Design a protein around this ligand. Structure first.
Ligand SMILES: O=P(O)(O)C(O)(Cc1cccc(-c2cccc(-c3ccccc3)c2)c1)P(=O)(O)O
Ligand SMILES: O=P(O)(O)C(O)(Cc1cccc(-c2cccc(-c3ccccc3)c2)c1)P(=O)(O)O
Ligand SMILES: O=P(O)(O)C(O)(Cc1cccc(-c2cccc(-c3ccccc3)c2)c1)P(=O)(O)O
Ligand SMILES: O=P(O)(O)C(O)(Cc1cccc(-c2cccc(-c3ccccc3)c2)c1)P(=O)(O)O
Ligand SMILES: O=P(O)(O)C(O)(Cc1cccc(-c2cccc(-c3ccccc3)c2)c1)P(=O)(O)O
Lengths: 227, 217
């Protein structure tokens, strides 16, 4: 399309701050945040973007017990189940990226079903990060290579970038062209690392609930002008 | 408190054009700006400064010339010099100059200055991977024992403080395959100022930005 942007990744941040300013509790920001997600996904689908990868940055996870962080992963991806039907009806291909290996088998089956169901859709490819880390991503790929070495099928010296690239999340999709981070912080926070080696980085102070189609348009135009 | 700053230096040629001068003129102004950045970092308690020359045999001799004429003063200033990158294919005289310069200064306790030469963040990670694959081949390591901490011990600069701030001059908003694994939690600061003009005030503005952002976030 005219903006020449095939794959956009977004670090969503600012929902709690947005609620706080309103005098509302965090759950109200979660709802406004969900609504801003739906709006970003329609925008991307309507603007010919091929893939949209979303990472929810939690400013609060440092105050929550580790036991709680695992459970929230439950509800989160669980919640994203009633939503699968809607994504499918909109011709979106859903993929979950992250470490879901420790997740209960019932949910892993659900994730696989969801991905299989929407795999042949021809609209936007939507990647949702769940228990995702950039370093972990690189490490799970390294492990896959470590198994081939242990099998006898790979010589350490044959490992190059191109080969490690085939084993990181989203390698079958267009490289990430643009990473947007809302909320004001200027860090990647262990979101994508290997995949953003050549991506344009766009930071905006706008809080996620307020980030709308015109903000997304501004980012794509900055990208178009910058490339 | 900012301990390790990484800078993507960019804008020398654009600067020269604006001045109506030739490329060599921007290179010269660029080198002076490198000296001023290093002095500044050393004078302000920064533990490590990592520099990457962004560009879209003669440079090899210049590299030798640069090491031969600057290493003594860096040594006197208690700077520890390290070159990061794939120098495996540089001519052996240059490889030897690099090795001696690093050896001469290895024990200094002031600023560690890392100069990227033929460096790439993906290559960096891949060299660490090869190291681990070797131990797997031998039999000293099981695939499933490989974790983040471990690969971290095999990527460049693992013995130094974590990179706190990455500064990129010149106007582009990309990492361009500079550090990747190492910038997971770093503050990213972009400025349109061209490298020859990047000065103490610009450097301080990035440091202040880092400090303020550390307070608010
Ligand atoms: O609602 P909160 O954030 O006030 C709290 O109950 C934690 C929590 C409870 C229920 C639901 C959620 C929730 C709802 C929607 C999204 C998310 C979320 C999405 C992505 C990353 C982190 C969190 C979490 C969080 P907390 O224990 O942190 O006070
Ligand atoms: O399908 P369209 O292009 O006709 C339209 O629904 C826009 C749209 C496109 C793709 C996805 C969505 C959409 C709608 C409802 C929910 C979601 C959704 C987004 C993220 C997670 C879960 C669900 C996405 C809407 P429109 O607003 O243009 O009529
Ligand atoms: O913005 P924060 O860091 O203040 C916070 O809302 C976490 C958060 C960040 C970004 C997005 C979301 C969020 C909230 C609700 C739904 C979703 C969502 C994500 C993906 C698909 C569909 C819905 C994401 C939550 P927190 O729970 O840590 O207060
Ligand atoms: O800024 P550019 O991309 O326009 C260009 O000057 C390349 C370049 C970028 C950044 C720094 C330098 C450069 C020039 C002179 C000296 C140094 C230098 C680097 C490290 C230690 C000492 C000196 C770096 C060159 P180019 O040769 O590609 O026109
Ligand atoms: O100064 P010049 O224009 O006479 C010439 O040496 C080019 C040149 C001189 C000095 C520095 C550089 C240069 C360009 C790009 C990168 C670097 C560099 C410097 C330090 C580390 C890594 C890379 C240096 C190029 P030339 O190739 O035109 O003979």
């Amino acid at each position: 399309p005219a903006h020449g942007c095939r794959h956009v990744a977004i670090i969503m941040d600012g929902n709690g701050r947005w609620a706080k300013k309103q005098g509302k509790i965090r759950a109200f920001g979660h709802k406004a945040g969900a609504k801003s997600v739906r709006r970003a996904v329609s925008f991307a689908a309507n603007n010919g973007i091929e893939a949209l990868t979303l990472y929810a940055f939690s400013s609060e996870n440092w105050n929550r017990p580790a036991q709680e962080v695992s459970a929230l992963m439950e509800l989160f991806v669980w919640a994203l189940d009633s939503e699968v039907k809607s994504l499918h009806r909109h011709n979106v291909r859903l993929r979950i990226i992250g470490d879901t290996s420790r997740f209960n088998s019932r949910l892993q089956e659900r994730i696989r079903k969801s991905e299989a169901l929407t795999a042949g859709n021809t609209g936007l490819t939507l990647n949702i990060a769940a228990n995702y880390g950039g370093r972990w991503d690189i490490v799970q790929g390294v492990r896959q290579l470590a198994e081939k070495v242990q099998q006898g099928n790979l010589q350490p010296d044959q490992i190059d970038e191109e080969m490690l690239n085939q084993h990181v999340c989203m390698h079958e999709l267009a490289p990430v062209d643009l990473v947007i981070r809302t909320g004001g912080e200027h860090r990647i926070s262990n979101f994508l690392l290997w995949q953003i080696a050549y991506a344009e980085l766009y930071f905006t102070d706008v809080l996620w609930p307020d980030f709308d189609e015109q903000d997304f348009e501004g980012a794509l135009n900055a990208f178009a002008n910058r490339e």
